[model samples]
Target: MVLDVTKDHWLLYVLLAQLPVMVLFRKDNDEEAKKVEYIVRELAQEFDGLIMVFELDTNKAPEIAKKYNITTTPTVAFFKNGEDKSVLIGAIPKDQLRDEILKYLG
Candidate 1:
């Protein structure tokens, strides 16, 4: 699905200080890109206007990781309004994922 990712997608950086949604990629999804596409679509609707999710190409995602020290795949980061927010690595259950998302929503 198409997310708010672009050169002017700086809105997400604003979210970095508060509750930003980040989706990372260590390896391009060989099998689950469709799954992720569906999930991200649902997440956009589920989270409404509060979440900002973006997937970065590992080959091009280094500067951010180096700045944040991410060492693994599927790392999801939650930032509150433009700061060095929180992080989650690995895949998780839907309910657990919702809870994790909610943790920073407030």
Candidate 2:
């Protein structure tokens, strides 16, 4: 499932990390963010329980944004054990994204 993460509910931001591939969006009213969300939703079910999923909007969680030093919007990222892994900018090629996840999970 796609969980929501924000500055206030950021406990997940710090404590919940087990291959949680979160998509950080710039704003709620943006199309790029919308597309990223659609992509994530499709992958979430395809990958299912293996990978955890979440959403972190920049406006809702600036701390994470600044901390992550995100210079771009809708960052499709992979993580393991709360540490950073790989990130994709612009259009996230889902096939490439899936391969990265497979590599990490392996």
Candidate 3:
């Protein structure tokens, strides 16, 4: 699975939080989500355990959006040490996202 089930989403953050995480949230049918997907996948492949990637489909799991206070349709939420570090809305420049990801993992 791309990510674990939502039921464990909160508690699992404790286990997952120490490493850098990038979670992209969006509906299943957005071009913007695809763009973010491409880069994030590439980055995750390029960096193994150093960084983690998860894409949330809000169509199924709206609770994450609600809990995280993400009103935007599509967002990239960063996490480190069990805390949210940043959010990127819509299609961000690839390099900008890469730069942001680099900061957390390093």
Candidate 4:
């Protein structure tokens, strides 16, 4: 018997292995959203291949916003094994964000 694997398949496997962080933010006149973006970017770089970061604009996706019940400008939701594990609302400091991520991811 023989098996075949492709680059895309390998990439999928790699992505599946890492934790996912979904960031929900408002787009209009929200400085906090920018702050959250900066923090996510920094953490994404620090975590490198260990984590996946996704950003969603709530205004563009009202359904998703409603699904997550996001009532704030900046919200972060963490997922593992395709399930939501934790959510942080508002623009928190980098240290606090790191702690929250470590709690679930580490």
Candidate 5:
């Protein structure tokens, strides 16, 4: 048997693949982590199909934290096409983060 595909299959696959926002946060701070999680949740809902959100622990992923120069709790990093874009450190207001995320919206 042979498999068949078409141009529309490629187009649909490409359209379905979404870039991700990597968030590296401290492990010891529950409050800060919760805040970041909530913010990411809200942003994910607003930017559905446009972006995906994931998180990493600073202690567990020290190399990633070092790569992004994350020395604080609740560091949110945006990545597109496997390229690092922006980094937001510490506890930030929801409104400010919305603006930051919007900057990369296309």
Candidate 6:
């Protein structure tokens, strides 16, 4: 599920929410983003900043994800210095997410 960047208070609370993966996409689609956000939110207490989920517009964010070879819905990746260090192909479990994210900050 994508989170809607345009939703009420979305920008305000987004930063405060803990995430294992930072979800990002173009502004055009956040419905899926929002769904994924709630799951992250549920696990917020255990992990904070586990991910940097983001919602970018197709016109704007496509290039960023494309650089990392994102070609489908719900794509997850690790980023450092605007480059993908590692990537997970599709919807993944929480433990798998934790492992992937730890690869970067842990």
List per-prediction Cα lDDT, in the order shown: 0.57, 0.67, 0.76, 0.64, 0.64, 0.51
lDDT of 4: 0.64
TM-score of each: 0.65, 0.75, 0.84, 0.72, 0.69, 0.51
Poorly placed runs, candidate 3 (over 4 Å):
14-16
Full-model lDDT, candidate 5 = 0.64
- Candidate 6 lDDT, 51-90, residue by residue in tens: 5655444454455555455676555555554444666544
* Candidate 5 lowest-lDDT run of ten: 1-10
Compared with the true structure, what per-residue lDDT tens digits does model 4 show for residues 1-106?
A: 0012343542354347456554444553678778877887788778766666666666666665676677787777776665567787777788887887777666
Give the range of the ten consecutive residues with the poorest summed lDDT in model 4. Answer: 1-10
TM-score of 6: 0.51
- Cα lDDT tens digits, model 3, 1-106, are 1655773665477456667888877774778768877877787787777877887777677776676887775688888877787998888878888899888867
At residue 24, candidate 2 shows an lDDT of: 44
Q: List the residue pairs that clash in candidate 5.
A: none
lDDT of 1 by residue, 1-106 (tens): 2223443344455544344564544444644444444455577578877876666655564656566677765555566656646665666445665786777777
The Cα error of candidate 1 at residue 16, in Å, is: 7.7
Best first by lDDT, ranked: 3, 2, 4, 5, 1, 6
Per-residue alpha-carbon lDDT of candidate 5 for residues 19-96, written as tens digits (9 for 90 to 100): 655454556467877887688778877887766665666676566567667877777777765556788777778887
> How far is 3's C-alpha from truth in model 1 (Å)?
8.3
- lDDT winner between candidates 1 and 5: 5
